[PDB]
Design a binder for this molecule. Structure first.
Ligand code: BV7
Length: 79
């Protein structure tokens, strides 16, 4: 599955990182405490634990459910 451009506007349901880790939900502070929440960023599609690029990175990403890995890019290709 692919994303367009830098993935900022990707709104798909992929939730797996490039190392096979599972994305943390954006609204959750567990395991990673963060500020990129749908409450703060209501228009970036920060739904469940779906891969997103709300901060002008270069591809969709997420905080990971591994407490030792803050975040990773998602295992998506560029369209
Ligand atoms: O630690 C955080 O809150 C975010 C770290 C990076 C998330 C991926 N894009 C660059 C910043």
């Amino acid at each position: 599955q692919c994303y367009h451009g830098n993935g900022q506007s990707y709104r798909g349901t992929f939730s797996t990182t490039v190392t096979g880790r599972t994305c943390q939900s954006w609204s959750s502070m567990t395991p990673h405490r963060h500020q990129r929440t749908p409450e703060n960023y209501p228009n970036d599609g920060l739904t469940m634990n779906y891969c997103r690029n709300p901060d002008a990175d270069t591809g969709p990403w997420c905080f990971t459910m591994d407490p030792s890995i803050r975040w990773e890019y998602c295992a998506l290709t560029r369209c």
